[PDB]
Write an enzyme that holds these catalytic residues in place. Structure first.
Site, PDB file in Angstrom:
ATOM      1  N   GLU A  65       0.770  -1.180  -0.067  1.00 36.33           N
ATOM      2  CA  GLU A  65       0.028  -0.080   0.052  1.00 36.33           C
ATOM      3  C   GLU A  65       0.757   1.153   0.123  1.00 36.33           C
ATOM      4  OE1 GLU A  65      -3.890   0.095  -0.021  1.00 36.33           O
ATOM      5  OE2 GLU A  65      -2.662   1.975  -0.872  1.00 36.33           O
ATOM      6  N   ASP A  93      -2.151  -5.267   0.964  1.00 36.82           N
ATOM      7  CA  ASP A  93      -1.415  -4.014   1.769  1.00 36.82           C
ATOM      8  C   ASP A  93       0.065  -4.400   2.305  1.00 36.82           C
ATOM      9  OD1 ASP A  93      -3.606  -2.298   1.607  1.00 36.82           O
ATOM     10  OD2 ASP A  93      -4.596  -3.112   3.047  1.00 36.82           O
TER      11      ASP A  93
HETATM   12  O1  LIG Z   1      -8.624  -1.063   2.970  1.00 38.72           O
HETATM   13  C1  LIG Z   1      -8.739  -0.986   1.545  1.00 38.72           C
HETATM   14  C2  LIG Z   1      -9.993  -0.874   0.994  1.00 38.72           C
HETATM   15  C3  LIG Z   1     -10.289  -1.073  -0.449  1.00 38.72           C
HETATM   16  C4  LIG Z   1      -9.018  -0.990  -1.424  1.00 38.72           C
HETATM   17  C5  LIG Z   1      -9.042  -1.184  -2.691  1.00 38.72           C
HETATM   18  N1  LIG Z   1     -10.307  -0.855  -3.189  1.00 38.72           N
HETATM   19  N2  LIG Z   1     -10.174  -0.693  -4.432  1.00 38.72           N
HETATM   20  C6  LIG Z   1     -11.402  -0.117  -5.101  1.00 38.72           C
HETATM   21  C7  LIG Z   1     -12.384   0.401  -4.236  1.00 38.72           C
HETATM   22  C8  LIG Z   1     -13.503   1.027  -4.834  1.00 38.72           C
HETATM   23  C9  LIG Z   1     -13.477   0.999  -6.356  1.00 38.72           C
HETATM   24 CL1  LIG Z   1     -14.974   1.656  -7.193  1.00 38.72          CL
HETATM   25  C10 LIG Z   1     -12.429   0.426  -6.975  1.00 38.72           C
HETATM   26  C11 LIG Z   1     -11.356  -0.118  -6.382  1.00 38.72           C
HETATM   27  C12 LIG Z   1      -7.852  -1.203  -0.678  1.00 38.72           C
HETATM   28  O2  LIG Z   1      -6.714  -1.389  -1.326  1.00 38.72           O
HETATM   29  C13 LIG Z   1      -7.587  -1.259   0.781  1.00 38.72           C
HETATM   30  O3  LIG Z   1      -6.406  -1.326   1.060  1.00 38.72           O
HETATM   31 MN   LIG Z   2      -6.572  -2.328   2.976  1.00 40.11          MN
HETATM   32 MN   LIG Z   3      -4.733  -1.423  -0.042  1.00 40.97          MN
END
Ligand SMILES: Oc1ccc(/C=N/Nc2ccc(Cl)cc2)c(O)c1O
Ligand SMILES: [Mn+2]
Ligand SMILES: [Mn+2]
Ligand SMILES: Oc1ccc(/C=N/Nc2ccc(Cl)cc2)c(O)c1O
Length: 181
Positions: A65, A93
Site C-alpha cells: 500500500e 497491503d
Molecule cells: O483497505 C482497503 C480497501 C479497499 C481497497 C481497494 N479498493 N479498491 C477499490 C475500491 C473502490 C472502487 Cl470503485 C474500485 C477499487 C484497498 O486497497 C484497501 O487497502
Molecule cells: Mn486495506
Molecule cells: Mn490496499
C-alpha cells in the site's frame, strides 16, 4: 462549538509523507480531495495503520500500500517469484515474510464482523490474511490469528482513538463516521 475543516485537520494531524501519498492515491483515482475530504482522511488513516503495522516489526513486512499501482504490482510479482507465494487477484497491503502471506488491512467504524465478512467475500483468496481495526478498539482477523502482539496492536488502537478524539473535538467525527461506504 466551532466546526473545523477536515482538510485543516488532516494536514495538522498526519505526517506530510502520509498526506502526500494520500493525495497521490486520490489523484490516481481522479478524485478531488477538496470535495471528498472525509475520504481523504480515511485514506490517511488507513495508510498510517498499514505503516504502523509494518513498523511493529521492522523488516518482517513488505509494504505494498502507498506505492504507485504499477510499482505495487511489480513488488507483488517479485515477492511471489522469490517466495513461491501465490499471486493474489487484488493488491493487498502488506507481505509477511515470517508467516509467508500477504495481508489486507481494513479500518472501519462499521461493525467489524460484518466488515470482515465483506472483505473476505470480496478477496476470494484462501491465502491473504485479513486484519480489521475499528476506531472503537475492536478488531477481527483471519482464523483469530492476530499476527502482532497486544502491545503493538494497542499502539495502533490508541492512535485510532486519538484521531477520533481530535476529530470529535473539532466537531468532525459525526460527518466522518457517517461518510463511510
Ligand atoms: O483497505 C482497503 C480497501 C479497499 C481497497 C481497494 N479498493 N479498491 C477499490 C475500491 C473502490 C472502487 Cl470503485 C474500485 C477499487 C484497498 O486497497 C484497501 O487497502
Ligand atoms: Mn486495506
Ligand atoms: Mn490496499
Ligand atoms: O465517499 C466516501 C467517503 C468515505 C469512504 C471511506 N470511509 N472510510 C471511513 C469513513 C469513516 C470512518 Cl469513521 C472510518 C472509515 C469511502 O469509501 C467513500 O466512497
Amino acid at each position: 462549538g466551532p466546526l473545523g475543516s477536515m482538510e485543516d485537520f488532516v494536514r495538522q494531524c498526519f505526517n506530510p509523507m502520509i498526506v502526500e501519498l494520500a493525495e497521490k492515491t486520490m489523484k490516481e483515482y481522479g478524485e478531488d480531495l477538496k470535495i471528498e475530504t472525509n475520504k481523504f482522511a480515511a485514506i490517511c488513516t488507513h495508510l498510517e495503520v498499514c505503516f504502523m503495522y509494518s513498523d511493529a516489526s521492522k523488516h518482517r513486512f513488505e509494504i505494498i500500500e502507498g506505492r504507485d499501482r504499477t510499482m505495487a504490482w511489480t513488488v507483488v510479482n517479485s515477492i511471489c517469484n522469490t517466495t513461491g507465494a501465490e499471486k493474489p487477484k487484488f493488491l493487498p497491503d502488506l507481505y509477511d515474510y515470517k508467516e509467508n502471506r500477504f495481508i489486507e488491512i481494513g479500518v472501519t467504524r462499521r461493525e467489524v464482523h460484518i466488515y470482515y465478512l465483506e472483505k473476505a467475500n470480496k478477496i476470494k483468496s484462501e491465502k491473504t490474511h485479513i486484519h480489521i481495526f475499528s476506531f472503537t478498539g475492536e478488531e477481527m482477523a483471519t482464523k483469530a490469528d492476530y499476527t502482532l502482539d497486544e502491545e503493538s496492536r494497542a499502539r495502533i488502537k490508541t492512535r485510532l482513538f486519538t484521531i477520533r478524539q481530535e476529530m470529535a473535538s473539532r466537531g468532525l467525527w459525526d460527518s466522518f463516521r457517517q461518510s463511510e461506504r
